[PDB]
Amino acid sequence: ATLNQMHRLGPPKHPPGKMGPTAGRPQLKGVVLRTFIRKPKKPNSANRKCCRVRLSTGREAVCFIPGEGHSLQEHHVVLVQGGRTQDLPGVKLTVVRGKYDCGHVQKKK
Amino acid sequence: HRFMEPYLFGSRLGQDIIDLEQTAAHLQLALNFTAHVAYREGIILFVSRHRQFAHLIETTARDCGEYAHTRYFKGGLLTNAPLLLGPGVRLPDLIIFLHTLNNVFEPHVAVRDAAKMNIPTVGIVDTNCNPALITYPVPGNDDSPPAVRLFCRLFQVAISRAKEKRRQVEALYRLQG
Amino acid sequence: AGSRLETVGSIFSRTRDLIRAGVLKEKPLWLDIYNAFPPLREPVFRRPRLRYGKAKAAVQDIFYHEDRIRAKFYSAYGSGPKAFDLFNPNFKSTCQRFVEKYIELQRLGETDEEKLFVEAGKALLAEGVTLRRVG
Amino acid sequence: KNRAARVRVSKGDKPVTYEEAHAPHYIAHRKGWLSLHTGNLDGEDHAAERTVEDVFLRKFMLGTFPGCLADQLVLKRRANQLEICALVLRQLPPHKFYFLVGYSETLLSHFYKCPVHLHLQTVPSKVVYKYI
Amino acid sequence: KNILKIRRRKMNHHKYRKLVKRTRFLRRKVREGRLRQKQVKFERDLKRIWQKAGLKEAPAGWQTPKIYLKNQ
RNA sequence: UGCCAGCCACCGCGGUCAUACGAUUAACCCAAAUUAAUAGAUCCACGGCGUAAAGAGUGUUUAAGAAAAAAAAUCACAAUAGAGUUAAAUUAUAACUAAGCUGUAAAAAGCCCUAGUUAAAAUAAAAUAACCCACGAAAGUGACUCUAAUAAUCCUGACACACGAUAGCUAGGACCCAAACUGGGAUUAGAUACCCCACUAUGCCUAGCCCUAAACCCAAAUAGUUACAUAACAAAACUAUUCGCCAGAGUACUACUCGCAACUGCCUAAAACUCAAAGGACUUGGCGGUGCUUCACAUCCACCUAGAGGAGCCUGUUCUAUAAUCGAUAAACCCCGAUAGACCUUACCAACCCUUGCCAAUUCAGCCUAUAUACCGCCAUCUUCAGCAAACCCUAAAAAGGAACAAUAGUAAGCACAAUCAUAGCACAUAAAAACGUUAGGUCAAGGUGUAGCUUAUGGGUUGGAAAGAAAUGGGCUACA
Ligand SMILES: [Mg+2]
Ligand SMILES: [Mg+2]
Ligand SMILES: [Mg+2]
Ligand SMILES: [Mg+2]
Ligand SMILES: [Mg+2]
Ligand SMILES: [Mg+2]
Ligand SMILES: [Mg+2]
Ligand SMILES: [Mg+2]
Ligand SMILES: [Mg+2]
Ligand SMILES: [Mg+2]
Ligand SMILES: [Mg+2]
Ligand SMILES: [Mg+2]
Ligand SMILES: [Mg+2]
Ligand SMILES: [Mg+2]
Ligand SMILES: [Mg+2]
Ligand SMILES: [Mg+2]
Ligand SMILES: [Mg+2]
Ligand SMILES: [Mg+2]
Ligand SMILES: [Mg+2]
Ligand SMILES: [Mg+2]
Ligand SMILES: [Mg+2]
Ligand SMILES: [Mg+2]
Ligand SMILES: [Mg+2]
Ligand SMILES: [Mg+2]
Ligand SMILES: [Mg+2]
Ligand SMILES: [Mg+2]
Ligand SMILES: [Mg+2]
Ligand SMILES: [Mg+2]
Ligand SMILES: [Mg+2]
Ligand SMILES: [Mg+2]
Ligand SMILES: [Mg+2]
Ligand SMILES: [Mg+2]
Ligand SMILES: [Mg+2]
Ligand SMILES: [Mg+2]
Ligand SMILES: [Mg+2]
Ligand SMILES: [Mg+2]
Ligand SMILES: [Mg+2]
Ligand SMILES: [Mg+2]
Ligand SMILES: [Mg+2]
Ligand SMILES: [Mg+2]
Ligand SMILES: [Mg+2]
Ligand SMILES: [Mg+2]
Ligand SMILES: [Mg+2]
Ligand SMILES: [Mg+2]
Ligand SMILES: [Mg+2]
Ligand SMILES: [Mg+2]
Ligand SMILES: [Mg+2]
Ligand SMILES: [Mg+2]
Ligand SMILES: [Mg+2]
Ligand SMILES: [Mg+2]
Ligand SMILES: [Mg+2]
Ligand SMILES: [Mg+2]
Ligand SMILES: [Mg+2]
Ligand SMILES: [Mg+2]
Ligand SMILES: [Mg+2]
Ligand SMILES: [Mg+2]
Ligand SMILES: [Mg+2]
Ligand SMILES: [Mg+2]
Ligand SMILES: [Mg+2]
Ligand SMILES: [Mg+2]
Ligand SMILES: [Mg+2]
Ligand SMILES: [Mg+2]
Ligand SMILES: [Mg+2]
Ligand SMILES: [Mg+2]
Ligand SMILES: [Mg+2]
Ligand SMILES: [Mg+2]
Ligand SMILES: [Mg+2]
Ligand SMILES: [Mg+2]
Ligand SMILES: [Mg+2]
Ligand SMILES: [Mg+2]
Ligand SMILES: [Mg+2]
Ligand SMILES: [Mg+2]
Ligand SMILES: [Mg+2]
Ligand SMILES: [Mg+2]
Ligand SMILES: [Mg+2]
Ligand SMILES: [Mg+2]
Ligand SMILES: [Mg+2]
Ligand SMILES: [Mg+2]
């Protein structure tokens, strides 16, 4: 605006980033509650294998399992990361495949 | 028009008056130009839309061995020449307006177009007309028949003299050889 | 080809410069003639802008003191009984005579309008012109 | 919209034979008949045979003379002999042309059990009636 | 056009008024409920001062009027 | 594999032929590292505020600032606040007179203590003048008169101060007429609405609150300039001094706070979450129970004739029934492919049978099997509609547009229409023709094909068998004399 205004208001500061689902950490350890299924948003349709998990942050969170096929039993321990899934509403947490109770999605050779 | 403000002399009771000194200075240069083109054996195209004078301007031009276009002006005429006129064609070397307007009081296309084509243009601006695209203007009255006639016969004569002088210098060229 | 841009600059500019870039391989006629005798102003394109605000024109209206007299003449008699001709370059009207008489009675050193006007009227009466005398 | 034996308007660049440019309703008005024989007149017999026969000679000439055929093939039947005229494009070296002349005449004559006469009129390029 | 912004507002307002009608008395509670907190916090605010300024009692002639609950 | 399994950082990919999935095959690029994740560095606005997010409802002053010269002239008269007054109309209420009066597209209800006329206070509201453009800071102000009266030797300025349309609230008056609500009456599937009829809060005054508007001329104040200059549209573009305001869209004139004579209020005004948009202006279409003109010539209306819907029968669909075809199925199906099924046709069902099984040769034949949303063929349809389209040319930019004949940027061969042909001479009439596209319109059962499937069978033969009517309906025929 004017100079006195730009003086009184200071220069603009770049606002600190809002921490996401992982609350700033790269990954999270988690424990399974109930394996289940969700339906995608409109233009595309499927059914995605989801879990409900608890995080070492003591928060419960809905997360996504990548790949075709898996074994996920209650009380299994998992690792999770912050990939958001573009199909579904509100699932912000992927499960890392290959660690703990989820082994690398199997090969059919 | 707003671009006549310099060429004007002043308002006499609401009617505007051109500066005749400037008229002569300009017209001299215009006629000189016209001539030097004629001598160099090139096309000259008179143009007017103005009805009163149509006949004059053709009757003038036909007698100069110069061409007139006094008529409706088809659109792509100079711009798209080879399609309109013929498979390949020569274009006017100089275009000369005895009025700068069309009967709807806009600038004649030929102005925009000549100017578009790198053709020089010699024309009579009037107090309402826009001079700025015309190569050599002559500020002056386009409307009164004494004026049209005058300008006609003058461009006529400049042409004729250029042509004669051409012939002569050609004969001298032929004796020198 | 060439350059068809009507706004960019004068035809002289474009042509000279396109030859300068050796695109146009043939010097055109009017070009050389032009170089020889250029016109007053380059034929450059200008938007015809409207005038806003306080801007007026530069034209000077046209008036003579002769006119300040003629005003009074037409104020009395009207347009001359001899009518007018715009074909005849030397035509003098009733008005013009009046102006001349008034100029000579001004060189006779009379500052009063009544005297100047009326006596000039007497000069034209002596010249046999009919002064209608309208109120 | 009648699609019968017609050639559609292109972007305007498509070359067209005089025949293929004249639509079915035009037969006997501008266009002529590609074949001639007695069989369809009022009191006449065996029209069918000359039709099968004709068809087979269309296919036969298209197949014996590859890529060199110009316009559709003109059959005439006169007093038991066939007169087969063809517009043929010049592709082949002339030897091959006469090889196939003899070949055709003989073969057909012995097939239809009637004497065949063959005529090739050679043309530099397909005649263009329209567009191009 | 810009009506399409106004439509939203129009709706959101209408849908709000309707709400505040059904919910009226629930609302009325929670308003007064907080006014009784206000007046109390206010009180404590001043109480804090006696106790901070060393006085035992509230100073002479202090009834500490109720501003927030003012009615009629 | 077939909107499934799955993938994507953004746009997105998977619905039978996926370079987006999973796996191969080639490549690409990094490389003792490579990807993924999460944090940073970097990243707004010395840009804006008519239509896009943003000039506060209004003025004055404080704080704080900015400063050459000129900068108080008058209402063309409707600021405000008082006090007084009334011309038109309307209403009480009488006098006559007639039975109706009111009310709509049409009615009904309603009222006849109604209606017309003649009289006539209060209350309320102020034709024409106004085609004027004044006065106020804004809200606002236009019947009449008188009183009081319109800040500042004139720059900007708030959360401070004083005002602020309607509606609303409190108390008291007023009440002609209007009128939310409500009750009747119609309309309607419904009609809590639009139309009708009553009647109320309320508009009115006096005093006190409330403080909101599309409070918008969506355009801040004060000095300037018309130079430079067209995003678009609208009211043409900009300096200089200031203050106020704007950092995606919702969420949200919202939740919590603070303050207020408000206590379904006003003001100030977030986040979680969700999305990859949300917005402004424009461009061609299409559409319009918008407006205007001009038509319809078997054609909408008005008109004329002869029929369909009823009856019997013929024949086609649709349903039920059958072991027992397929296709068409708004206009553009329904005596339709059929100018045609007793066997045949024949594709169907039932049983039996035959496996280089038509041909010159072929790990080859043969398939009325799935794709008409892969197609060519032939057509329907707008359509007796006038447009389609290359090659160019123009437009202070072009998505696109491109005419005016006392002509203003259009030229253009082509295909359409038109013209000619046919109906044995004319003419008209009919026939024919009728592009580009549209309907993923029709048809893999005329034939042919792309992709898929079948191969001792989805192939090829022999023998029989089908096409019954509870009905429902389309078109015909014959009648009713
Ligand atoms: Mg991911
Ligand atoms: Mg047809
Ligand atoms: Mg909403
Ligand atoms: Mg609360
Ligand atoms: Mg499924
Ligand atoms: Mg595949
Ligand atoms: Mg990719
Ligand atoms: Mg892949
Ligand atoms: Mg490393
Ligand atoms: Mg930057
Ligand atoms: Mg702007
Ligand atoms: Mg806005
Ligand atoms: Mg915002
Ligand atoms: Mg404002
Ligand atoms: Mg303010
Ligand atoms: Mg507001
Ligand atoms: Mg000070
Ligand atoms: Mg200053
Ligand atoms: Mg009062
Ligand atoms: Mg009265
Ligand atoms: Mg009365
Ligand atoms: Mg009355
Ligand atoms: Mg009515
Ligand atoms: Mg009644
Ligand atoms: Mg009025
Ligand atoms: Mg006004
Ligand atoms: Mg003042
Ligand atoms: Mg001030
Ligand atoms: Mg108010
Ligand atoms: Mg009120
Ligand atoms: Mg009342
Ligand atoms: Mg009363
Ligand atoms: Mg009433
Ligand atoms: Mg009701
Ligand atoms: Mg209805
Ligand atoms: Mg209505
Ligand atoms: Mg009442
Ligand atoms: Mg009022
Ligand atoms: Mg207003
Ligand atoms: Mg407005
Ligand atoms: Mg505003
Ligand atoms: Mg301000
Ligand atoms: Mg001021
Ligand atoms: Mg300036
Ligand atoms: Mg534009
Ligand atoms: Mg936001
Ligand atoms: Mg509000
Ligand atoms: Mg609120
Ligand atoms: Mg506050
Ligand atoms: Mg009819
Ligand atoms: Mg019709
Ligand atoms: Mg009947
Ligand atoms: Mg019947
Ligand atoms: Mg059937
Ligand atoms: Mg059945
Ligand atoms: Mg079917
Ligand atoms: Mg079908
Ligand atoms: Mg159909
Ligand atoms: Mg029929
Ligand atoms: Mg049978
Ligand atoms: Mg079969
Ligand atoms: Mg199907
Ligand atoms: Mg189709
Ligand atoms: Mg097809
Ligand atoms: Mg046409
Ligand atoms: Mg075009
Ligand atoms: Mg004829
Ligand atoms: Mg005809
Ligand atoms: Mg026809
Ligand atoms: Mg025709
Ligand atoms: Mg279909
Ligand atoms: Mg259909
Ligand atoms: Mg087939
Ligand atoms: Mg095939
Ligand atoms: Mg069999
Ligand atoms: Mg059988
Ligand atoms: Mg029936
Ligand atoms: Mg009958």
PDB file of N, CA and C (backbone and C1' of nucleotides) in Angstrom, chain F residues 231-242:
ATOM      1  P     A F 231      -4.670  -2.224 -21.633  1.00  0.00           P
ATOM      2  O5'   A F 231      -5.921  -3.131 -22.015  1.00  0.00           O
ATOM      3  C5'   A F 231      -6.295  -4.205 -21.166  1.00  0.00           C
ATOM      4  C4'   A F 231      -6.371  -5.512 -21.912  1.00  0.00           C
ATOM      5  C3'   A F 231      -7.769  -5.921 -22.349  1.00  0.00           C
ATOM      6  O3'   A F 231      -8.130  -5.379 -23.615  1.00  0.00           O
ATOM      7  C1'   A F 231      -6.795  -7.684 -21.117  1.00  0.00           C
ATOM      8  P     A F 232      -9.418  -4.419 -23.776  1.00  0.00           P
ATOM      9  O5'   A F 232     -10.658  -5.387 -23.514  1.00  0.00           O
ATOM     10  C5'   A F 232     -10.777  -6.631 -24.196  1.00  0.00           C
ATOM     11  C4'   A F 232     -11.799  -7.536 -23.547  1.00  0.00           C
ATOM     12  C3'   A F 232     -13.111  -6.879 -23.165  1.00  0.00           C
ATOM     13  O3'   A F 232     -13.991  -6.763 -24.254  1.00  0.00           O
ATOM     14  C1'   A F 232     -12.342  -8.115 -21.347  1.00  0.00           C
ATOM     15  P     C F 233     -14.641  -5.345 -24.575  1.00  0.00           P
ATOM     16  O5'   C F 233     -15.767  -5.176 -23.461  1.00  0.00           O
ATOM     17  C5'   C F 233     -16.948  -5.963 -23.499  1.00  0.00           C
ATOM     18  C4'   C F 233     -17.613  -6.026 -22.153  1.00  0.00           C
ATOM     19  C3'   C F 233     -18.163  -4.719 -21.622  1.00  0.00           C
ATOM     20  O3'   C F 233     -19.423  -4.392 -22.178  1.00  0.00           O
ATOM     21  C1'   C F 233     -16.919  -5.778 -19.935  1.00  0.00           C
ATOM     22  P     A F 234     -19.769  -2.872 -22.579  1.00  0.00           P
ATOM     23  O5'   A F 234     -19.847  -2.093 -21.180  1.00  0.00           O
ATOM     24  C5'   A F 234     -20.846  -2.412 -20.216  1.00  0.00           C
ATOM     25  C4'   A F 234     -20.596  -1.782 -18.860  1.00  0.00           C
ATOM     26  C3'   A F 234     -20.422  -0.275 -18.808  1.00  0.00           C
ATOM     27  O3'   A F 234     -21.650   0.415 -18.875  1.00  0.00           O
ATOM     28  C1'   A F 234     -18.775  -1.287 -17.477  1.00  0.00           C
ATOM     29  P     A F 235     -21.812   1.623 -19.912  1.00  0.00           P
ATOM     30  O5'   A F 235     -20.674   2.634 -19.477  1.00  0.00           O
ATOM     31  C5'   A F 235     -20.860   3.453 -18.343  1.00  0.00           C
ATOM     32  C4'   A F 235     -19.805   4.510 -18.285  1.00  0.00           C
ATOM     33  C3'   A F 235     -18.380   3.969 -18.278  1.00  0.00           C
ATOM     34  O3'   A F 235     -17.529   5.064 -18.671  1.00  0.00           O
ATOM     35  C1'   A F 235     -18.763   5.052 -16.275  1.00  0.00           C
ATOM     36  P     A F 236     -16.592   5.075 -19.992  1.00  0.00           P
ATOM     37  O5'   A F 236     -15.102   4.991 -19.412  1.00  0.00           O
ATOM     38  C5'   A F 236     -14.237   3.894 -19.696  1.00  0.00           C
ATOM     39  C4'   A F 236     -13.010   4.355 -20.435  1.00  0.00           C
ATOM     40  C3'   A F 236     -11.746   4.588 -19.629  1.00  0.00           C
ATOM     41  O3'   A F 236     -11.025   3.421 -19.308  1.00  0.00           O
ATOM     42  C1'   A F 236     -12.071   6.389 -21.092  1.00  0.00           C
ATOM     43  P     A F 237     -10.309   3.351 -17.875  1.00  0.00           P
ATOM     44  O5'   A F 237      -8.755   3.618 -18.121  1.00  0.00           O
ATOM     45  C5'   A F 237      -8.181   3.732 -19.408  1.00  0.00           C
ATOM     46  C4'   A F 237      -6.934   4.566 -19.330  1.00  0.00           C
ATOM     47  C3'   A F 237      -6.227   4.532 -17.992  1.00  0.00           C
ATOM     48  O3'   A F 237      -5.427   3.369 -17.830  1.00  0.00           O
ATOM     49  C1'   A F 237      -6.393   6.762 -18.757  1.00  0.00           C
ATOM     50  P     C F 238      -4.736   3.034 -16.416  1.00  0.00           P
ATOM     51  O5'   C F 238      -3.688   4.210 -16.233  1.00  0.00           O
ATOM     52  C5'   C F 238      -3.656   4.959 -15.031  1.00  0.00           C
ATOM     53  C4'   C F 238      -2.835   6.212 -15.180  1.00  0.00           C
ATOM     54  C3'   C F 238      -2.247   6.737 -13.885  1.00  0.00           C
ATOM     55  O3'   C F 238      -1.026   6.099 -13.581  1.00  0.00           O
ATOM     56  C1'   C F 238      -3.329   8.493 -15.022  1.00  0.00           C
ATOM     57  P     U F 239      -0.621   5.839 -12.056  1.00  0.00           P
ATOM     58  O5'   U F 239       0.657   6.763 -11.880  1.00  0.00           O
ATOM     59  C5'   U F 239       0.750   7.648 -10.787  1.00  0.00           C
ATOM     60  C4'   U F 239       1.190   9.020 -11.211  1.00  0.00           C
ATOM     61  C3'   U F 239       1.470   9.959 -10.054  1.00  0.00           C
ATOM     62  O3'   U F 239       2.785   9.795  -9.562  1.00  0.00           O
ATOM     63  C1'   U F 239       0.015  11.012 -11.563  1.00  0.00           C
ATOM     64  P     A F 240       3.056   8.883  -8.266  1.00  0.00           P
ATOM     65  O5'   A F 240       3.204   9.958  -7.108  1.00  0.00           O
ATOM     66  C5'   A F 240       3.770  11.223  -7.394  1.00  0.00           C
ATOM     67  C4'   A F 240       3.133  12.304  -6.573  1.00  0.00           C
ATOM     68  C3'   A F 240       2.675  11.904  -5.181  1.00  0.00           C
ATOM     69  O3'   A F 240       3.745  11.767  -4.249  1.00  0.00           O
ATOM     70  C1'   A F 240       1.025  13.248  -6.216  1.00  0.00           C
ATOM     71  P     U F 241       3.718  10.635  -3.093  1.00  0.00           P
ATOM     72  O5'   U F 241       2.920  11.326  -1.906  1.00  0.00           O
ATOM     73  C5'   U F 241       3.143  12.689  -1.588  1.00  0.00           C
ATOM     74  C4'   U F 241       2.046  13.212  -0.706  1.00  0.00           C
ATOM     75  C3'   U F 241       1.509  12.233   0.319  1.00  0.00           C
ATOM     76  O3'   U F 241       2.358  12.103   1.447  1.00  0.00           O
ATOM     77  C1'   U F 241      -0.292  13.322  -0.743  1.00  0.00           C
ATOM     78  P     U F 242       2.649  10.658   2.095  1.00  0.00           P
ATOM     79  O5'   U F 242       1.628  10.573   3.299  1.00  0.00           O
ATOM     80  C5'   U F 242       0.608   9.599   3.278  1.00  0.00           C
ATOM     81  C4'   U F 242      -0.706  10.185   3.693  1.00  0.00           C
ATOM     82  C3'   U F 242      -1.703   9.172   4.193  1.00  0.00           C
ATOM     83  O3'   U F 242      -1.432   8.750   5.509  1.00  0.00           O
ATOM     84  C1'   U F 242      -2.759  10.508   2.625  1.00  0.00           C
TER      85        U F 242
END
